[PDB]
Amino acid sequence: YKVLAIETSCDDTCVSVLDRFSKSAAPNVLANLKDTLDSTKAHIHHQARIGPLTERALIESNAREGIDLICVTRGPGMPGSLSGGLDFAKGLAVAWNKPLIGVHHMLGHLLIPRMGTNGKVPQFPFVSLLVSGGHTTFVLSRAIDDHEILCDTIDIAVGDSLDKCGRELGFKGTMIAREMEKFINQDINDQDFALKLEMNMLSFSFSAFITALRTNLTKLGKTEIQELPEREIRSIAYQVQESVFDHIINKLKHVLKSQPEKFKNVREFVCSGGVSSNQRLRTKLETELGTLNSTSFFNFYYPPMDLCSDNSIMIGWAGIEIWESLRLVSDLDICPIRQWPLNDLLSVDGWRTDQ
Amino acid sequence: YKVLAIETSCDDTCVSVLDRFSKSAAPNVLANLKDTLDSTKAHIHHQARIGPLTERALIESNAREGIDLICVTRGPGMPGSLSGGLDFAKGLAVAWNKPLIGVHHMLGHLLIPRMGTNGKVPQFPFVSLLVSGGHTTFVLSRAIDDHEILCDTIDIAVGDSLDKCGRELGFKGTMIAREMEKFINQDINDQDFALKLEMNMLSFSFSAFITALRTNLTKLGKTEIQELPEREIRSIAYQVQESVFDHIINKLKHVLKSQPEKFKNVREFVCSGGVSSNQRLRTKLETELGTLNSTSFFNFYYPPMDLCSDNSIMIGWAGIEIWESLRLVSDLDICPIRQWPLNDLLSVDGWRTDQ
Ligand SMILES: [Ca+2]
Ligand SMILES: [Ca+2]
Ligand SMILES: [Zn+2]
Ligand SMILES: [Zn+2]
């Protein structure tokens, strides 16, 4: 019971060998990642990486003959890109004569925080916020097959919104979003508070913030970010970050108080993704949700950045949960599904019982 | 030394397990084929077939652990379609820890008639005519890496030309071309001979024959094929087939007599493909080329229709020739090449020495 896992949906080519010692613990043997170089197609990249990225991951891992289950991403994404990992996984499966479990990409993200505790700590009736550079979704899980989208982005994601409006302020590094947070947190008190930069049910909107900041900048004193002093650009950065997060909080507060019947048994909140790394977002979440009466008490869990960002360990974990708790295996004639819905996880063709 | 071979370039999904008993003989263990149903994308078809088409081909064959070399089509064709076989072959290779040899599709066709005699009877300095529904090429091989295109189609192929102009005559079956030959050969003497239907260096042209037949039909008596008697449509079918073949012969006669230095050591002619099944084409080839003085004497070889039409056995054979006579193996980072030239066989990236 050594799980070979693959992630080939976006730009990250991931290969990870897991070790399931018993049905109570799951330490990770090996984990590889190769991202697309940018100033080369994603499908061609994955197709050229997967092969040599698995042999090295098998040479460095326990054994090449010790693999018992092959997990791969059948999930949402580019068909051509994820066919690279899928057809390769079929090749491993046929050659070793072992099962294949085609995993939903988003299911990996939602199930990943359960691996460390062997699906115990984030107990089945739970609620989750997926704040990344690509996602912005508020999901309620009732079981591994049941998932309810309570609030999702109709515009762009937080990562993009904070990176786009952050670029207007002057920041231009590798991870634009966190550099702004580090600038605000270098000296939180030294700000020009005088610079008052002041700006349906199941939806989030972010594409307006960049447009609203530019109008706020043209109305107020100066627009030239290069000439602007450090204290003034810090009161702007604080206020933009405050408004972006106030919108998320206000929509989570709206969801919880509107239908508390769905949240009667939720005892754990999971904030996963790139933006979860923000200490203000964390403190805002824990402050507001913990004081409201109608809202049920929570226990906030912030997973590591390695597991949060697209990796293969999550596919290997979600596959473990499906092979064990549902006892299902994907058919060998499996094909990529571009816009595979999460509720349409077991409705679509390809499932075969192992029980 | 059991070769797993794959063909996923066009519409035929092929998987074949070969048995190399010694470096003197090569009997074929298993061979599978699944073609695209037509009134479903070719890439999606190959991607869904390859997996289950290999497991059954491995269950019915000798063993699943007995495979020593993995041959696959890297050759010309649809990138998405042939990625299905390639990524799958990588999966087998990585899993079994065995070599991979990415084969040129056209090299399979040219090398296939050597398998039965273990590369002896069609001796190295040879000339070949590839007359199929997709090809119409006159190739000279000097070694397995050296190939000279002496005459090729600039329009459409013989198979298409005979099927398109045959359809104008009334035939509408599964294999249109051969049905016309069978109609001409049912009673070759009963024809209306009075119906005289009368119609640069390295090139063949066929798209003109259909247009020239229609003009010949409008000029002569009647066009309505339904009302037309069987004897008259037989003199048309004979004359169209005679003109199509006379053009091929005249261009082969031109090539040989223009540069006889290239043909000083050629002792064998190989006519392979769908149109090679025609007895008149065969008799025309053997008559004309055998009476001309400047042209070197030939020994005509007509391979079976199974090996001629797109299959995986040829990839497994061409791979055997490359692994043995050249001692080369393709790298695991291999990717599909859409318009891979035959002279650019070893010039392109991906080759690694096994010696
Ligand atoms: Ca099926
Ligand atoms: Ca290379
Ligand atoms: Zn993702
Ligand atoms: Zn072909």
Numbering used by the authors:
A (entry chain A), B (entry chain A): 33 to 71, 80 to 239, 251 to 406
Paper lines:
N6-threonylcarbamoyladenosine (t6A) is one of the 15 universally conserved tRNA modifications found in all three domains of life. With the sole exception of bacterial initiator tRNAfMet, t6A is present at position 37 of the anti-codon stem loop of all tRNAs with ANN recognizing anticodons (N being any nucleotide). This modification serves to strengthen the codon–anticodon interaction and promote translational fidelity by the ribosome. Toward this end, we show that yeast Sua5 and Qri7 (the mitochondrial paralogue of Kae1) are sufficient for t6A biosynthesis in vitro. In summary, the eukaryotic t6A biosynthesis system functions first through Sua5, which generates TCA using its adenylation function and then secondly through Qri7, which binds to TCA to conjugate the threonyl-carbamoyl moiety onto directly bound tRNA substrates.
To shed light onto the structural basis for the unique functional properties of Qri7, we solved the structure of yeast Qri7. Qri7 exhibits the prototypical bilobal structure with its catalytic region sandwiched between subdomains I and II. Crystal structures of Kae1 orthologues (like ASKHA fold proteins in general) display variability in interlobe closure, and the Qri7 structure is notable in adopting the most open configuration reported to date for a Kae1 orthologue. Projection of conservation onto the Qri7 structure identified a large contiguous surface emanating from the catalytic cleft. A portion of the conserved surface was accounted for by the expected binding sites of TCA and phosphate coordinating metal ions. The binding of acceptor substrate (tobramycin) in the evolutionarily related TobZ crystal structure identifies these unaccounted for conserved surfaces at the tips of subdomains I and II as the possible tRNA substrate-binding surface. Application of crystallographic symmetry to the Qri7 monomer structure revealed a dimer configuration with a large (2087.5 Å2) hydrophobic buried surface, which is partially conserved across Qri7 orthologues. Remarkably, the Qri7 dimerization surface is the same surface used by archaeal and eukaryotic Kae1 proteins to bind Pcc1, a dimerization module within KEOPS and the same surface used by the bacterial orthologue YgjD to bind YeaZ. We confirmed that Qri7 forms homodimers in solution with a dissociation constant of 60 nM by equilibrium analytical ultracentrifugation. The R104A and K130A mutants displayed a dimerization dissociation constant of 3.0 ± 0.3 μM and 2.5 ± 0.2 μM, respectively. These results confirm that Qri7 forms homodimers in solution through the same binding mode revealed in the crystal structure.
